Amino acid sequence: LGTELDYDTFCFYYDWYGSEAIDGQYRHWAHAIAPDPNGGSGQNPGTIPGTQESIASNFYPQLGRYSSSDPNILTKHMDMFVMARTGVLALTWWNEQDETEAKRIGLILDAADKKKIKVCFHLEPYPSRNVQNLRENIVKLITRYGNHPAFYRKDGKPLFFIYDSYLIEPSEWEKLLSPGGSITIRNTAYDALMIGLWTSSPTVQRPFILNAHFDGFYTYFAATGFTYGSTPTNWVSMQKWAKENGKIFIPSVGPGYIDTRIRPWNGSVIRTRTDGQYYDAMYRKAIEAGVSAISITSFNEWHEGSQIEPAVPYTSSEFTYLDYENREPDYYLTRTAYWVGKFRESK
């Protein structure tokens, strides 16, 4: 029918939003404003309070200030994934070691399964992250969730995205990811496809990826040109290198970028949506590069303005939000479905 989910399409999902009613605070809708790293001492940037009028986004959710723990929101999000044809939800994972995290992960897996969506984890730069506690956490996640019907596998293997994987030296990664490594997961019950973050130039990244024994790489950033990896004119050559070296390249595409409510000094990174033309251009470059898998930044990173989740026009007494302009609130979901179809036609 040309409507089915694609299980080589990964959409980055954030479960960090809270409401007073469910979570005790409007978590993440309220957010600290970052000081300017070049703006000197004594800055008092303040906070966005997460009121109805003033939330930590330049856009405004159709679903309002929702809780990521609300089963009825999760249902709606899974229906949005179905509309977008995105078969894998790539869940932010911060190693919070708290019961409210555990509850949310279970709720997300359960809701996903009702719609045949799969879930993988996006391993974030949590405090003192290192290859030993990464192994322990991979073991825990596979043990806890590996028998859940929504747990993602590719040819029998789980898959993890590793954000800011450059914060760990290749000599450490080798211990976890080489078949001969001291604490290897290879050939164990806990083996997985490990997808590292390609940032800078090939001269740095090629030996990093090889020496670290990653199975593949992704680029994350929705803003074109932010890094070498997030410059789509490099994707043909990145894919050629991946194929030559038996690596999986999963370029990240997004619909735009703007984070100036939380980072007012970061205007140079703004990428305008132009009624969908930015998203179209980026998605076309990924498909044209001949890749096997694509990642989408993001479902709902509202702070960074990369979301495809529906947004509505809103002007409050405190802020005039951006909105999808000439496009309807669900445009980025249905445009994702269009591109998934083009990707499948190519695959």
Ligand X SMILES: OC[C@H]1O[C@H](O[C@@H]2C=CO[C@H](CO)[C@H]2O)[C@@H](O)[C@@H](O)[C@@H]1O
Task: Report in angstroms how near the CB of residue 184 gets to ligand X at its nearest.
Answer: 26
CB atoms inside a 10 Å sphere around CB 336: 26
Can you tell me the distance from the alpha carbon of 28 to that of 216, in angstroms, rounded to the nearest whole number?
31
Q: Using CA atoms in the order 166, 184, 157, 161, what is the torsion angle rounded to 10 degrees?
A: -10
156 neighbors 146 (Cβ within 8 angstroms): no
Q: Which residue is nearest to ligand X (CB)?
A: 303
Can you tell me the distance from the alpha carbon of 23 to that of 9, in angstroms, rounded to the nearest whole number?
31
Task: Report in angstroms how near the CB of residue 297 gets to ligand X at its nearest.
Answer: 7
Length of the chain equals 347
Task: Report in angstroms how near the CB of residue 259 gets to ligand X at its nearest.
Answer: 6
Task: Report in angstroms how near the CB of residue 103 gets to ligand X at its nearest.
Answer: 20
Q: Considering beta carbons, is residue 13 or 151 the nearer one to ligand X?
A: 13
Specify the DSSP class assigned to residue 298: -
Residue corresponding to tokens 């019907």: 149
Q: Considering beta carbons, is residue 166 or 287 the nearer one to ligand X?
A: 166
Specify the DSSP class assigned to residue 139: H
Task: Report in angstroms how near the CB of residue 342 gets to ligand X at its nearest.
Answer: 26
Can you tell me the distance from the alpha carbon of 338 to that of 340, in angstroms, rounded to the nearest whole number?
6
Q: Considering beta carbons, is residue 119 or 287 the nearer one to ligand X?
A: 119
Can you tell me the distance from the alpha carbon of 9 to that of 88, in angstroms, rounded to the nearest whole number?
6
Give the rounded distance of the alpha carbon of 208 from its chain centre. 22
Can you tell me the distance from the alpha carbon of 56 to that of 266, in angstroms, rounded to the nearest whole number?
15
Q: Considering beta carbons, is residue 163 or 249 the nearer one to ligand X?
A: 163
Can you tell me the distance from the alpha carbon of 26 to that of 328, in angstroms, rounded to the nearest whole number?
27
Task: Report in angstroms how near the CB of residue 147 gets to ligand X at its nearest.
Answer: 26
Q: Considering beta carbons, is residue 254 or 337 the nearer one to ligand X?
A: 254
Task: Report in angstroms how near the CB of residue 188 gets to ligand X at its nearest.
Answer: 27
Q: Considering beta carbons, is residue 65 or 191 the nearer one to ligand X?
A: 65
Q: Considering beta carbons, is residue 13 or 287 the nearer one to ligand X?
A: 13
Sheet holding 86-93, edge to edge: 248-250, 216-218, 193-197, 159-162, 118-123, 86-93, 6-13, 294-296, 252-253
List, in order, residues 6 or more apart from 102 with CB less than 8 Å away.
none
- Residue ranges that bind ligand X, judged by CB under 6 A: 12, 92, 122, 124, 163, 301, 303-304
Q: Considering beta carbons, is residue 247 or 303 the nearer one to ligand X?
A: 303
Task: Report in angstroms how near the CB of residue 77 gets to ligand X at its nearest.
Answer: 17
